[PDB]
């Protein structure tokens, strides 16, 4: 199993975040994770499970679900991820997730609806050498219903860039930059450029 500890700062929202995440995978193909996230402007819990269906030596499909709890209520995210181990050192992934909210919120028409979201994620991971792995995750999400993001649009993006250092077989420090679109909100103003800078470490328990 792996414990991941991460700290970050978001420039638009002027917010620190921390994450503690524990994950395990099994030989039968199951995988599960649980995490807690904190956010402090100058909490949530998520649980995820999936299963690997091996289509051949290089291709895997993982149906799964992400459940998310916060002050507003519960959100469920059933998904299917397709992964391709193109080489020993290069992996690609694509995931569709439907983030469905178990609670209603006021929409832009004044009605109480569900702020459900269609979410797509692309993944590239490249093992550069014994010392370094570089990962990029690109994200698009769009509103199913009559809502908008803080960028004033029905859609938004995230792009995350992670450099992992394989310090020991069981310890992997990493640094990360994310651009989270103009989703920053601070001091009563939205549409702020949201740069995110993170540092963390992943280790074997
Ligand atoms: C790349 C920068 C790493 C940032 C590490 C963030 C650690 C969390 C700090 C918690 C303090 C929150 N605060 C400032 C509101 O008290
Ligand atoms: C091994 C740590 C991984 C996180 C596991 C989650 C355990 C439950 C903690 C819930 C957080 C309680 N809180 C902060 C919302 O008050
Ligand atoms: C649409 C073009 C897709 C980009 C291809 C990425 C390059 C790595 C693929 C090489 C793997 C070939 N093979 C047969 C060993 O699996
Ligand atoms: C989840 C990644 C999606 C990959 C995009 C489509 C490129 C597929 C390449 C086919 C593989 C060719 N082959 C059998 C020689 O490895
Ligand atoms: C003056 C507040 C800036 C805090 C930025 C933190 C960078 C890691
Ligand atoms: C505006 C804050 C910038 C934080 C940079 C962190 C070190 C690259
Ligand atoms: C035999 C491998 C099939 C590749 C999976 C394609 C899924 C659209
Ligand atoms: C034998 C490999 C087939 C590739 C299918 C690609 C699905 C996006
Ligand atoms: C030698 C293979 C490099 C091509 C990788 C392109 C990834 C989209
Ligand atoms: C001051 C502009 C922030 C963009 C930094 C990009 C880091 C890779
Ligand atoms: C792999 C290159 C993606 C760069 C996207 C950055 C958008 C701010
Ligand atoms: C390759 C990371 C740079 C992303 C561009 C966003 C900076 C404003
Ligand atoms: C409380 C967050 C800790 C940040 C981890 C940094 C590891 C180098
Ligand atoms: Cl619905
Ligand atoms: Cl729009």
From Swiss-Prot:
Family classification: Belongs to the oligogalacturonate-specific porin KdgM (TC 1.B.35) family. NanC subfamily.
Location(s), subcellular: Cell outer membrane
Periplasmic face residues: 1-2, 27-29, 54-58, 85-89, 127-131, 168-170, 204-205
Membrane topology designation: Multi-pass membrane protein
Main location: membrane
Cellular component GO terms, alphabetical: cell outer membrane; pore complex
Keywords from the UniProt entry: Cell outer membrane, Ion transport, Membrane, Porin, Signal, Sugar transport, Transmembrane, Transmembrane beta strand, Transport
GO biological process, one term: sialic acid transport
Protein name per its UniProtKB record: N-acetylneuraminic acid outer membrane channel protein NanC
Catalytic reaction list: N-acetylneuraminate(in) = N-acetylneuraminate(out)
Transmembrane segments: 3-9, 17-26, 30-38, 44-53, 59-69, 75-84, 90-99, 119-126, 132-140, 158-167, 171-179, 196-203
GO molecular function term, any single one: sialic acid transmembrane transporter activity
Description of what induces expression: Induced by N-acetylneuraminate and modulated by N-acetylglucosamine. This regulation occurs via the NanR and NagC regulators. NanC expression is also activated by the regulators cyclic AMP-catabolite activator protein, OmpR, and CpxR.
Protein species of origin: Escherichia coli (strain K12)
Subunit annotation: Monomer.
């Amino acid at each position: 199993a792996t414990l991941d500890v991460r700290g970050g700062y978001r420039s638009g929202s002027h917010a620190y975040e921390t994450r503690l995440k524990v994950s395990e995978g099994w030989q039968n193909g199951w995988w599960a994770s649980m995490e807690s996230n904190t956010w402090n402007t100058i909490n949530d819990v998520q649980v995820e499970v999936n299963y690997a269906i091996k289509l051949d030596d290089q291709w895997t499909v993982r149906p799964g679900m992400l459940t998310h709890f916060s002050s507003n209520g519960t959100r469920y995210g059933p998904y299917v991820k397709l992964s391709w181990d193109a080489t020993k050192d290069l992996n690609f992934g694509i995931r569709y997730r439907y983030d469905w909210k178990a609670y209603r919120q006021q929409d832009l028409s004044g009605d109480m609806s569900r702020d459900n979201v269609h979410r797509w994620d692309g993944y590239v991971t490249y093992h550069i050498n014994s010392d370094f792995t570089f990962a990029w995750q690109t994200t698009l999400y769009s509103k199913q219903n009559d809502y908008r993001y803080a960028n004033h649009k029905k859609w938004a993006t995230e792009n995350a860039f992670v450099l992992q250092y394989h310090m020991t077989p069981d310890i992997t420090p990493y640094i990360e930059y994310d651009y989270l679109d103009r989703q920053g909100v601070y001091n009563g103003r939205d549409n702020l450029s949201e740069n995110s800078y993170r540092i963390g470490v992943s280790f074997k328990l």
